Short mmCIF file of all heavy atoms in Angstrom, two decimals:
data_model
loop_
_atom_site.label_atom_id
_atom_site.label_comp_id
_atom_site.label_asym_id
_atom_site.label_seq_id
_atom_site.Cartn_x
_atom_site.Cartn_y
_atom_site.Cartn_z
N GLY A 252 -5.71 -13.10 52.35
CA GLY A 252 -6.26 -13.33 53.68
C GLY A 252 -6.40 -12.08 54.53
O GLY A 252 -6.78 -12.19 55.70
N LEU A 253 -6.14 -10.90 53.97
CA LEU A 253 -6.25 -9.64 54.69
C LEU A 253 -7.16 -8.71 53.90
O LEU A 253 -7.45 -8.93 52.73
CB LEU A 253 -4.87 -8.99 54.88
CG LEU A 253 -3.84 -9.87 55.60
CD1 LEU A 253 -2.46 -9.26 55.49
CD2 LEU A 253 -4.25 -10.07 57.04
N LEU A 254 -7.62 -7.64 54.56
CA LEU A 254 -8.36 -6.58 53.88
C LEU A 254 -7.39 -5.42 53.66
O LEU A 254 -6.92 -4.81 54.63
CB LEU A 254 -9.59 -6.18 54.69
CG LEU A 254 -10.66 -7.27 54.79
CD1 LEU A 254 -11.80 -6.86 55.72
CD2 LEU A 254 -11.19 -7.62 53.41
N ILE A 255 -7.07 -5.13 52.40
CA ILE A 255 -6.08 -4.13 52.05
C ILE A 255 -6.75 -2.99 51.29
O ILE A 255 -7.93 -3.06 50.93
CB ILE A 255 -4.91 -4.70 51.23
CG1 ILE A 255 -5.38 -5.12 49.84
CG2 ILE A 255 -4.28 -5.88 51.96
CD1 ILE A 255 -4.23 -5.43 48.87
N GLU A 256 -5.98 -1.94 51.05
CA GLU A 256 -6.48 -0.84 50.21
C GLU A 256 -6.62 -1.32 48.77
O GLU A 256 -5.70 -1.97 48.26
CB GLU A 256 -5.53 0.36 50.28
CG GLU A 256 -5.52 1.05 51.62
CD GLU A 256 -4.79 2.38 51.58
OE1 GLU A 256 -4.44 2.84 50.47
OE2 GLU A 256 -4.57 2.96 52.66
N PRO A 257 -7.73 -1.04 48.10
CA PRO A 257 -7.99 -1.64 46.79
C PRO A 257 -7.01 -1.17 45.72
O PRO A 257 -6.61 -0.01 45.68
CB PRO A 257 -9.41 -1.17 46.45
CG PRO A 257 -10.06 -0.99 47.78
CD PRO A 257 -8.96 -0.48 48.70
N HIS A 258 -6.67 -2.10 44.83
CA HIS A 258 -5.82 -1.77 43.70
C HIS A 258 -6.55 -0.89 42.69
O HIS A 258 -5.95 0.00 42.09
CB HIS A 258 -5.35 -3.06 43.02
CG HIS A 258 -4.29 -3.77 43.78
ND1 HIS A 258 -3.00 -3.31 43.86
CD2 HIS A 258 -4.33 -4.92 44.49
CE1 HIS A 258 -2.28 -4.15 44.58
NE2 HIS A 258 -3.06 -5.14 44.97
N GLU A 259 -7.85 -1.12 42.50
CA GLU A 259 -8.60 -0.45 41.44
C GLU A 259 -9.13 0.87 42.00
O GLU A 259 -10.30 1.00 42.36
CB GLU A 259 -9.70 -1.35 40.91
CG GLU A 259 -10.13 -1.02 39.48
CD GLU A 259 -10.76 0.36 39.37
OE1 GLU A 259 -11.99 0.49 39.57
OE2 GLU A 259 -10.02 1.33 39.09
N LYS A 260 -8.26 1.85 42.05
CA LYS A 260 -8.55 3.04 42.83
C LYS A 260 -8.79 4.25 41.93
O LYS A 260 -8.29 4.29 40.79
CB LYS A 260 -7.42 3.35 43.82
CG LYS A 260 -6.06 3.46 43.17
CD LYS A 260 -4.95 3.74 44.19
CE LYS A 260 -4.40 2.46 44.80
NZ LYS A 260 -3.16 2.73 45.61
N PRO A 261 -9.56 5.24 42.40
CA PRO A 261 -9.95 6.36 41.52
C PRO A 261 -8.78 7.12 40.92
O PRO A 261 -8.92 7.67 39.82
CB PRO A 261 -10.80 7.26 42.43
CG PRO A 261 -10.78 6.62 43.79
CD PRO A 261 -10.32 5.23 43.66
N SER A 262 -7.63 7.17 41.61
CA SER A 262 -6.47 7.85 41.05
C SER A 262 -6.03 7.25 39.72
O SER A 262 -5.36 7.92 38.93
CB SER A 262 -5.31 7.81 42.05
OG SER A 262 -4.95 6.48 42.39
N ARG A 263 -6.37 5.99 39.45
CA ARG A 263 -6.08 5.42 38.14
C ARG A 263 -6.71 6.28 37.04
O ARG A 263 -6.02 6.74 36.12
CB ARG A 263 -6.61 3.98 38.05
CG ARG A 263 -5.95 2.99 39.01
CD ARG A 263 -6.66 1.61 38.93
NE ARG A 263 -6.42 1.03 37.61
CZ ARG A 263 -7.33 0.91 36.65
NH1 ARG A 263 -8.59 1.28 36.85
NH2 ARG A 263 -6.97 0.40 35.47
N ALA A 264 -8.02 6.51 37.12
CA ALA A 264 -8.70 7.26 36.07
C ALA A 264 -8.24 8.71 36.04
O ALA A 264 -8.12 9.31 34.97
CB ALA A 264 -10.21 7.16 36.26
N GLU A 265 -7.97 9.29 37.22
CA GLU A 265 -7.59 10.71 37.26
C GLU A 265 -6.21 10.93 36.66
O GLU A 265 -5.98 11.96 36.01
CB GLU A 265 -7.64 11.23 38.69
CG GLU A 265 -9.04 11.25 39.31
CD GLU A 265 -10.01 12.17 38.57
OE1 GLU A 265 -9.56 13.16 37.94
OE2 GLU A 265 -11.23 11.91 38.62
N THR A 266 -5.30 9.96 36.83
CA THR A 266 -3.96 10.07 36.29
C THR A 266 -3.95 9.93 34.78
O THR A 266 -3.24 10.66 34.08
CB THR A 266 -3.04 9.01 36.93
OG1 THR A 266 -2.96 9.23 38.35
CG2 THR A 266 -1.64 9.06 36.32
N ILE A 267 -4.72 8.97 34.25
CA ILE A 267 -4.86 8.86 32.80
C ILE A 267 -5.43 10.15 32.23
O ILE A 267 -4.91 10.71 31.26
CB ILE A 267 -5.72 7.64 32.43
CG1 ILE A 267 -5.04 6.34 32.87
CG2 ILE A 267 -5.98 7.64 30.94
CD1 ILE A 267 -5.95 5.13 32.73
N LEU A 268 -6.53 10.64 32.83
CA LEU A 268 -7.16 11.86 32.35
C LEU A 268 -6.17 13.02 32.33
O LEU A 268 -6.13 13.80 31.37
CB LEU A 268 -8.37 12.20 33.22
CG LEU A 268 -9.09 13.49 32.81
CD1 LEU A 268 -9.83 13.25 31.51
CD2 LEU A 268 -10.05 13.94 33.90
N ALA A 269 -5.35 13.13 33.38
CA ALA A 269 -4.36 14.21 33.42
C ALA A 269 -3.37 14.09 32.27
O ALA A 269 -2.94 15.10 31.71
CB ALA A 269 -3.64 14.21 34.76
N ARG A 270 -2.99 12.86 31.92
CA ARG A 270 -2.07 12.68 30.81
C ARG A 270 -2.76 13.01 29.48
O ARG A 270 -2.14 13.59 28.58
CB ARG A 270 -1.51 11.27 30.82
CG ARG A 270 -0.50 10.97 29.74
CD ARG A 270 0.85 11.64 30.00
NE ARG A 270 1.84 11.26 28.99
CZ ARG A 270 3.09 11.72 28.97
NH1 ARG A 270 3.50 12.57 29.90
NH2 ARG A 270 3.93 11.32 28.03
N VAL A 271 -4.03 12.63 29.34
CA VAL A 271 -4.80 13.00 28.15
C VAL A 271 -4.79 14.51 27.96
O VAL A 271 -4.60 15.01 26.85
CB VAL A 271 -6.24 12.45 28.24
CG1 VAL A 271 -7.11 13.05 27.13
CG2 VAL A 271 -6.25 10.91 28.14
N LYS A 272 -4.98 15.26 29.05
CA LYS A 272 -4.95 16.71 28.96
C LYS A 272 -3.54 17.22 28.68
O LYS A 272 -3.34 18.10 27.84
CB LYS A 272 -5.49 17.33 30.25
CG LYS A 272 -6.98 17.14 30.46
CD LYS A 272 -7.39 17.64 31.85
CE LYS A 272 -8.88 17.44 32.06
NZ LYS A 272 -9.30 17.80 33.44
N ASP A 273 -2.56 16.69 29.41
CA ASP A 273 -1.19 17.17 29.28
C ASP A 273 -0.66 16.96 27.87
O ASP A 273 0.14 17.76 27.38
CB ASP A 273 -0.29 16.47 30.30
CG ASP A 273 1.19 16.77 30.08
OD1 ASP A 273 1.63 17.85 30.51
OD2 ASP A 273 1.89 15.93 29.48
N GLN A 274 -1.09 15.89 27.21
CA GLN A 274 -0.64 15.60 25.86
C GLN A 274 -1.54 16.18 24.79
O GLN A 274 -1.26 15.99 23.60
CB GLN A 274 -0.52 14.09 25.67
CG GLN A 274 0.51 13.45 26.60
CD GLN A 274 1.92 13.87 26.26
OE1 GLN A 274 2.44 13.50 25.22
NE2 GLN A 274 2.54 14.65 27.14
N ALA A 275 -2.61 16.88 25.18
CA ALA A 275 -3.57 17.41 24.22
C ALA A 275 -3.93 16.34 23.19
O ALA A 275 -3.80 16.54 21.98
CB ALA A 275 -3.03 18.67 23.54
N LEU A 276 -4.33 15.17 23.70
CA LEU A 276 -4.66 14.06 22.80
C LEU A 276 -5.82 14.42 21.89
O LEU A 276 -5.82 14.08 20.70
CB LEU A 276 -5.00 12.82 23.63
CG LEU A 276 -5.43 11.56 22.86
CD1 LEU A 276 -4.28 11.05 22.03
CD2 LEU A 276 -5.89 10.46 23.82
N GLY A 277 -6.82 15.11 22.42
CA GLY A 277 -8.01 15.41 21.66
C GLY A 277 -9.10 15.93 22.58
O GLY A 277 -8.86 16.20 23.76
N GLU A 278 -10.30 16.07 22.02
CA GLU A 278 -11.41 16.54 22.83
C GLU A 278 -11.72 15.52 23.91
O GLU A 278 -11.59 14.32 23.71
CB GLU A 278 -12.64 16.78 21.96
CG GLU A 278 -13.67 17.72 22.59
CD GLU A 278 -15.03 17.64 21.91
OE1 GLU A 278 -15.12 17.03 20.82
OE2 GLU A 278 -16.00 18.18 22.47
N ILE A 279 -12.13 16.03 25.07
CA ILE A 279 -12.60 15.21 26.19
C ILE A 279 -14.06 15.56 26.43
O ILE A 279 -14.41 16.74 26.56
CB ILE A 279 -11.78 15.46 27.47
CG1 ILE A 279 -10.30 15.20 27.20
CG2 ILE A 279 -12.32 14.60 28.63
CD1 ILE A 279 -9.36 15.81 28.24
N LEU A 280 -14.92 14.55 26.47
CA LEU A 280 -16.34 14.76 26.70
C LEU A 280 -16.86 13.81 27.76
O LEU A 280 -16.27 12.76 28.04
CB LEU A 280 -17.18 14.57 25.43
CG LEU A 280 -17.06 13.28 24.64
CD1 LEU A 280 -18.31 13.10 23.81
CD2 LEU A 280 -15.83 13.35 23.72
N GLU A 281 -17.97 14.21 28.35
CA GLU A 281 -18.68 13.39 29.30
C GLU A 281 -19.67 12.50 28.57
O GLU A 281 -20.07 12.80 27.44
CB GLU A 281 -19.38 14.29 30.33
CG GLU A 281 -18.40 14.86 31.35
CD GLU A 281 -19.04 15.81 32.34
OE1 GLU A 281 -20.24 16.13 32.20
OE2 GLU A 281 -18.34 16.24 33.28
N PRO A 282 -20.06 11.37 29.16
CA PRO A 282 -20.91 10.43 28.43
C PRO A 282 -22.36 10.89 28.36
O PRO A 282 -22.86 11.57 29.26
CB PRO A 282 -20.81 9.15 29.28
CG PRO A 282 -20.56 9.67 30.68
CD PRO A 282 -19.60 10.82 30.45
N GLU A 283 -23.03 10.48 27.29
CA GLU A 283 -24.48 10.55 27.17
C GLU A 283 -25.13 9.40 27.97
O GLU A 283 -24.49 8.40 28.30
CB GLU A 283 -24.91 10.48 25.70
CG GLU A 283 -24.24 11.52 24.80
CD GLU A 283 -24.62 11.36 23.32
OE1 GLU A 283 -25.61 10.66 23.02
OE2 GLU A 283 -23.90 11.93 22.47
N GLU A 284 -26.41 9.57 28.27
CA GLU A 284 -27.18 8.55 28.99
C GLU A 284 -27.90 7.68 27.97
O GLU A 284 -28.81 8.15 27.27
CB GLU A 284 -28.17 9.17 29.97
CG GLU A 284 -29.04 8.12 30.70
CD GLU A 284 -28.19 7.16 31.51
OE1 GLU A 284 -27.62 7.61 32.52
OE2 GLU A 284 -28.08 5.96 31.13
N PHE A 285 -27.50 6.41 27.88
CA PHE A 285 -28.14 5.46 26.98
C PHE A 285 -29.17 4.57 27.67
O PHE A 285 -29.88 3.84 26.99
CB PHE A 285 -27.07 4.58 26.29
CG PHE A 285 -26.19 5.33 25.32
CD1 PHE A 285 -25.08 6.04 25.76
CD2 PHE A 285 -26.48 5.33 23.96
CE1 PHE A 285 -24.27 6.73 24.88
CE2 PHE A 285 -25.67 6.03 23.07
CZ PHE A 285 -24.56 6.72 23.53
N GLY A 286 -29.27 4.64 29.00
CA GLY A 286 -30.24 3.84 29.73
C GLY A 286 -29.80 2.39 29.79
O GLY A 286 -28.73 2.01 29.31
N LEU A 287 -30.66 1.56 30.37
CA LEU A 287 -30.30 0.16 30.59
C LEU A 287 -30.54 -0.73 29.38
O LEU A 287 -30.12 -1.89 29.39
CB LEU A 287 -31.08 -0.38 31.79
CG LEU A 287 -30.68 0.16 33.17
CD1 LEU A 287 -31.67 -0.36 34.22
CD2 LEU A 287 -29.28 -0.27 33.50
N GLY A 288 -31.20 -0.22 28.33
CA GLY A 288 -31.43 -1.00 27.13
C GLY A 288 -30.16 -1.65 26.60
O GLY A 288 -30.04 -2.89 26.57
N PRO A 289 -29.19 -0.84 26.20
CA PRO A 289 -27.95 -1.40 25.65
C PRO A 289 -27.18 -2.26 26.64
O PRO A 289 -26.45 -3.16 26.22
CB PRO A 289 -27.15 -0.16 25.23
CG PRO A 289 -28.20 0.91 25.01
CD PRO A 289 -29.25 0.63 26.04
N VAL A 290 -27.33 -2.01 27.94
CA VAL A 290 -26.70 -2.88 28.94
C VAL A 290 -27.34 -4.26 28.93
O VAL A 290 -26.65 -5.29 28.96
CB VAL A 290 -26.79 -2.23 30.34
CG1 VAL A 290 -26.26 -3.18 31.41
CG2 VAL A 290 -26.05 -0.89 30.39
N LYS A 291 -28.67 -4.30 28.88
CA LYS A 291 -29.41 -5.56 28.93
C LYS A 291 -29.38 -6.31 27.61
O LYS A 291 -29.95 -7.40 27.52
CB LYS A 291 -30.86 -5.29 29.38
CG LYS A 291 -30.99 -4.92 30.88
CD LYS A 291 -32.32 -4.25 31.21
CE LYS A 291 -33.26 -5.19 31.94
NZ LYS A 291 -34.42 -4.47 32.54
N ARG A 292 -28.73 -5.78 26.58
CA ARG A 292 -28.44 -6.59 25.40
C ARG A 292 -27.34 -7.60 25.69
O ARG A 292 -27.18 -8.56 24.94
CB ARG A 292 -28.05 -5.70 24.22
CG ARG A 292 -29.15 -4.77 23.72
CD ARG A 292 -30.28 -5.54 23.06
NE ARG A 292 -29.93 -6.02 21.72
CZ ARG A 292 -30.49 -7.08 21.14
NH1 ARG A 292 -31.43 -7.77 21.79
NH2 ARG A 292 -30.13 -7.44 19.92
N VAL A 293 -26.61 -7.41 26.78
CA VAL A 293 -25.50 -8.27 27.16
C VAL A 293 -25.72 -8.92 28.51
O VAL A 293 -25.36 -10.09 28.71
CB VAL A 293 -24.18 -7.46 27.15
CG1 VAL A 293 -23.16 -8.04 28.11
CG2 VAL A 293 -23.62 -7.40 25.73
N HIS A 294 -26.30 -8.19 29.46
CA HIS A 294 -26.42 -8.65 30.84
C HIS A 294 -27.87 -8.99 31.15
O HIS A 294 -28.80 -8.38 30.60
CB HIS A 294 -25.90 -7.57 31.80
CG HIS A 294 -24.43 -7.36 31.73
ND1 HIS A 294 -23.52 -8.21 32.31
CD2 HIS A 294 -23.70 -6.38 31.14
CE1 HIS A 294 -22.29 -7.77 32.08
NE2 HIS A 294 -22.37 -6.66 31.37
N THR A 295 -28.08 -9.96 32.03
CA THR A 295 -29.44 -10.38 32.33
C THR A 295 -30.15 -9.36 33.22
O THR A 295 -29.52 -8.64 34.01
CB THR A 295 -29.47 -11.75 33.01
OG1 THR A 295 -29.08 -11.63 34.38
CG2 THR A 295 -28.55 -12.74 32.31
N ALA A 296 -31.48 -9.29 33.08
CA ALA A 296 -32.27 -8.34 33.86
C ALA A 296 -32.15 -8.60 35.36
O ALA A 296 -32.16 -7.66 36.17
CB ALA A 296 -33.74 -8.40 33.43
#
Side-chain angles (χ1 to χ4, degrees):
Chain A
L253 304 169
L254 293 175
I255 68 168
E256 291 191 9
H258 285 287
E259 204 295 273
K260 55 181 86 170
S262 59
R263 297 174 67 252
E265 295 297 333
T266 298
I267 296 171
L268 179 72
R270 182 73 176 179
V271 170
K272 290 173 181 175
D273 171 80
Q274 298 292 292
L276 178 65
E278 201 196 349
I279 304 162
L280 54 158
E281 284 177 355
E283 306 176 16
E284 178 60 69
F285 292 84
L287 290 173
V290 175
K291 287 162 106 167
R292 296 291 285 155
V293 152
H294 292 282
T295 76

